[PDB]
Structure formats: C-alpha cells, structure tokens
C-alpha cells in the first residue's frame, strides 16, 4: 500500500520534525542517561510529552538503554555536553535523537505493511562528502522505541528506497514557495535563503532561467562552517566569567537560558549582560554580511527576495536586514523551513 | 576511407558549428576555469549538454585543465572578460573554444582511420594577412578532449590536407544559394552579403559574369573593423552608469542580457534604457549605410538582392533595410550562414 511520510531535521541546535499529517515536533538536541521517573509523576502530570521525553530504545540484540532526551535532558546536570558535541552523523547521540523524532511522529495504529518514507538532510557542503554515511546508517537503522510513562512503542527499521536525502535549505525555497513565488520570479533573477543555524550558517541561492524554472548555483552558495548561533553562546560564556571575576561558570541550562534574554538570575541577583548580547549579535550579523558578499560580487544587485530562515534568523532579522534592506523578508515558520521543505519536496516521490 | 566533415566558425561573439550530418551547435565564446560539478548535478539534471559544458582538455604532454566554457562560463563571475578579449587566433582561449566545437560535433563511434575535414574561417581582410597563423596552429593542434558528467572523450589531432580555409561570408552566398539564385542572377549584376558580426561587420559582394558565374570584387568589398554589435554593448554600458549616477556597473552576464531586451532588473527594480537601445541601433545602422556607400558609388543601383546575415542582422533587419528597401532580404539561418556556407562549399573537396 501507500508508504507514510515523515520529514526530520538533524540540526545540532534542536531537532525539527514534521509528518505527512502536519503534526510537528521540536526539542533541543540533548540526551542524557534516563532513570526511573515515578515520584515526579505523582507531583505534576506529564501533559505535554515533548517536555518530558523519557524513553527506552531497543536494538537488534534487544539491549535497551533508558534515555532522558530533549527538554528533560536539559534539566539534567549530567547530560550531553552539547557545546563540544560530536560532529559525526553516525554517532549514538544522533542515533537516539533520530529515534525520538521518529517516535513522536508515527501516529497510532498505522498498518505495518505501510512503511514510511523519511526525508532527512545534510549540510550543503557536506551533502556530497558525507552522503554515504547517513545513507548506510539509515540502512543500518533497526531499533524499537519505548515511551516510558505513556506506554506506546513503535517499531523503527528502514530498508532502502524509503530513505531520501536532500541538502539543508534546498527544498525550503525549491518547494514551499514554488506555488507562491510564481508572481515574484521573473527571469535571470536570484532568490536567496540564509539559514542561521546553530553551528553552521547556510547560504543557498537559485537562478531563475529563461523557462522560469529554478536552477542551482554552487559557486554562488556555500555553508559557513564555524559561523552561526554557537558563536554567541561561546562568547557570552566568556563574557559571564569576565563579569563574574570569580571563576564561576554557567552550566548548559543557564547558558542556553542566557542568550534568549541576556539576564541570568545568578546568586540571588540578576547578572546583566544585555550590552554584550546586542554587541555580539551585530558581530555575528557582520560575519554574515561580509561572507555573503564573498560569494556575491555585483551579483547582489540581481536579487529579488532574500529569504532568511533557521532559529537564529528569527532573533537576528532586524540586524541581518542590512544585507539588502526592504527587499529581504522572513520565512513563515523560521524553524520548520527545512522541515516543510523536506515534506513537500519529499512528496514528489 | 572517406573523411568526415565539420564546419566551425571562430566568431568572437558566439562559436557556430555544424557537421556533415547537419547537427549544429551554438554557444557564446566565453571560457572560465572549470571546477568540480557534483552538488549541482543532484539538483537539476544536465538535459542539454550545450548549456552546461564542463570539459577537460589534454595535450601532447597530457597536462589537462578543466574549463567552464560557453553558456556555463557566462554564469561564472571569474570568466574571460570578453569585451577586451585577445584578438590573436592562436590564443589558448581560441584553442579551448576550437576543441569544444569539435567535441560536440564528432558523433559516437566514428572509425578512427576516417579523419575529419574541418572548414574554418578568417575575416575577409585578414584571410591573406593572418592565413599562416591558423594554417600552422591547426597543424600544431593535438589534444584529447574529455566531457565531464557525460563520460565521452574525443581524440582531436589534424594533419595537413584535412584543414581548409575560406573567408568569412564567402561560401554563404557562393554556395548555399548557388542552386537557388539561378533564377535571380542574370548578367552583370551584383549580389551583396552584409554579415553584422560582433566585433567586425563583413561586406562582401560578387559579380555575375557573362557566363552567369559569380566572381569576386575585392575593391567593392571589405570588412568593417571596429563596427559591429560590440559598439552597442560598449555604448549601453556607458548608458547604464550614466543613468545610475552611482558608479555601479553591470557584469558580463547583465550586459549581454541588456541589449537583447533593454530592461535589466537592477536592485529590486527595472532600470529602463529602452530609448537608448533603439537610438544606438540606428546609430550602428547608420554606420553600415554610410560605409556600404563608401565602397559602392553608383554601383549600388546594379544590385539585385542584398542579403544580410550574422546574429546582428536578425536584430537590425528593419533598421538595416534602408540601404536598399524592398530589394534586400534576410538569409534563412542568420547565425549559421557562415556555418552552412563552410559546409557545402567545403563539400567541394
Ligand atoms: N526564541 C529564541 N531566542 C533565542 N534564540 C533562539 C530562539 N529560538 C531559536 N533560537 C536559536 O536558534 C537555534 C536553532 O536553530 P535551528 O533552526 O534549529 O538550526 P539547526 O538546524 O542548526 O539546529 C538555537 O540554538 C537557538 O540559539
Ligand atoms: N536574439 C538576439 N538578441 C540580441 N542580440 C543577438 C541575438 N542573437 C544574436 N545577437 C547578437 O549577435 C551577435 C552574434 O553574432 P555572430 O553571427 O555570432 O557573429 P560573429 O561571427 O562575429 O560572432 C551576438 O554578440 C549578439 O549580440
Ligand atoms: Mg538548520
Ligand atoms: Mg561572423
């Protein structure tokens, strides 16, 4: 019969997912060793399962391990360190996160003969170099998940011809605007997508041909490795210790709490770093202006709409506007641009 | 056995070619340093190889270099500058372009003992002065081409008695109309071909003798050096910067896009120069009227059919009509007049 569709993202910041039925999940990419949650169940009921993902994951040898994963793992003091996390796409940390995003997006009582076409992503520079790693790992993927405290398990095993690879930010403007940008694309124009990710910033462009079809410009588009939201969290971590003059250091929860607001509540008091937050965000925005113009010479004039996406684009939209003011806009769902783009352009097959 | 036939043109605007089997190619005369195309292969398939000519060219020392050549090189921002391109016929830029036109016109699985008679051209004033340059260079020509992304290679090496030189615009009306103009040539008449090329405009005539055979009039025919389509692109480039009043300047892609339409899409807006386009095309047409009458005194009355050809003749046919209205016509394939003329009049041998 027909095979199901689930679009997932493998972003180091936060795993983003959506299914065929437009139910979507989002949670930070943090795991920890799960332990038995029974006492805290009595105090506060788990209304939202996304907040409290305790999970059990089997394998082919049925060697289960518990995992605090996602939002609950951020509350744990022994979690994955997440600021020097492994960059390997075949890591067990990526294995658990991939299982969890599949766990929340398979609805109840699907037919077991009906499989799932899953659509994933790689960074745009790494889509050729690191292709066969995730291509073989998803072939190697054979587990069975178990949700503690909610008592529903899912079987997770994929053959070939179910998995599907598209680059990061590719289908976000290849599809998802293809019905809408027909009035906006004209001829010999350029559209631009700037995904401000956590570790790596994506810059991807497309040329509109004479036949009013998009086509890709690999010499006008690249992935900025080492430039992204992580440079803010790495800088403001140093800015806190220098403001402390004690050697005290925020943990992984306090640090990710910091650069959403800039005002951590530290030792009965707010330690204010609001000046260094606005300063470092312009510092990141400057290193996306000047790197866009490295790929874009006088070609910058020929654009018609620079879209931006990613989680970081939402918090930088005013500062990042000055690449091309009053032309550039914001995509509709800044996190789920890669998700919906993998969904619709994954529905081609 | 029988030796194959390929007719090529060496026009600075766009290389025009045709084979013995009437398969013909056309691409602009732009090269650039080729790089590895693998990521863009995944996005959009190369259906037409003429659009996406990535190529590898060996030599006698097997020193290969990659080349983005033709339409793809126009999309590159580091290409051959093409507005001050070298006029040398023995340049490496001419070497690569000559190899590429031979690459697309040798069909699959020809016998290696069967060679190819290639027919080229020189400008009509330069056919005597610059004869031995291309005559020796094609003797010096020894390479082996490799098409990336399509995986077919061709061996390219020519001895003497395969190469063949005819002037530009010569065989276009010497042959290619010789079967058809029998009803139109009478006696002591003049036929005229005006090739509006990119850099140089060709004016070539023929006298019909008493024996109803064509014969050449070198004092009634010359090549207009410095007059041609390039004077439009050089003028409208100045017209854009003067309309901008910013110092901004179009690149090689935007400039060649301009004077096919006159309306470049510049910084979210159309910068209109439609008035200066119609004005400069009459300015070029005036400098072909007055230069034709420099060679043609009261001899102008004795014509019977002024043909025009070249790429520029197609876009100037209405303005250039006023040399001799309602006598003058347009050749059938305005680009391939030199190509088919080199083909049939190259089939004499
Ligand atoms: N409301 C917010 N306030 C501050 N930062 C945010 C907010 N939402 C998202 N972010 C930042 O955006 C990042 C998420 O980026 P994301 O689009 O998931 O890219 P990736 O695919 O690389 O993980 C987070 O690391 C976070 O720092
Ligand atoms: N559709 C078109 N619109 C505008 N200009 C054109 C068009 N087709 C051809 N041309 C012009 O004609 C030139 C091609 O001339 P061509 O016949 O190749 O002469 P040459 O042998 O000197 O290269 C191009 O440089 C271009 O400017
Ligand atoms: Mg991303
Ligand atoms: Mg010509």
Numbering used by the authors:
A (entry chain 1), B (entry chain 0): 1 to 349
Excerpt from the paper describing this PDB structure:
Within each cross-section, an intermediate layer consisting of six hexagonal protomers showed the best local resolution. Inter-strand averaging for this intermediate layer led to a 4.2 Å map for the protofilament. The major difference between the monomer and filament protomers was the folding of a disordered region into a helix in F-ParM (F helix). The nucleotide-binding site in the pCBH G-ParM and F-ParM structures contain ADP and the magnesium ion is coordinated by Asp9, Asp195, and Gln168 equivalent to Asp11, Asp154, and Gln137 in actin, suggesting a common mechanism of ATP hydrolysis in which Gln168 (Gln137) directs the hydrolytic water towards the ATP γ-phosphate for nucleophilic attack. Next, we examined the pCBH ParM filament structure to understand how a single protomer forms strands of different lengths and twists. Firstly, the central interaction region involves long-chain charged and polar residues between subdomains 2 and 4 from the lower protomer and subdomain 3 from the upper protomer. Secondly, hydrophobic residues on the F helix from the subdomain 2 of the lower protomer fit into the hydrophobic pocket between subdomains 1 and 3 of the upper protomer. The hydrophobic residues in this interaction have fewer rotatable bonds than in the central interaction site. This architecture allows the hydrophobic interaction region to act like a ball-and-socket while the central interaction region is elastic due to the flexible long-chain interactions. The linker residues on either side of the F-helix are relatively flexible, which adds further pliancy into the intra-strand contacts.
Functional ParMRC plasmid segregation systems comprise an actin-like polymerizing motor (ParM), a centromere-like specific DNA sequence (parC), and an adaptor protein (ParR), which attaches a plasmid, via the parC, to each end of the growing ParM filament or filament bundle. Thus, the force generated from ParM polymerization is harnessed for plasmid segregation. Here we investigated the ParMRC cassette from pCBH, a 257 kb plasmid that carries the botulinum neurotoxin type B. This ParMRC cassette is also found on other C. botulinum plasmids, such as pCLK (267 kb) and pRSJ2_3 (245 kb), which encode neurotoxin types A and F, respectively. Despite the similarities to actin, pCBH ParM is a genuine ParM, since it has a closed β-barrel, a feature that is missing from actin and MreB structures.
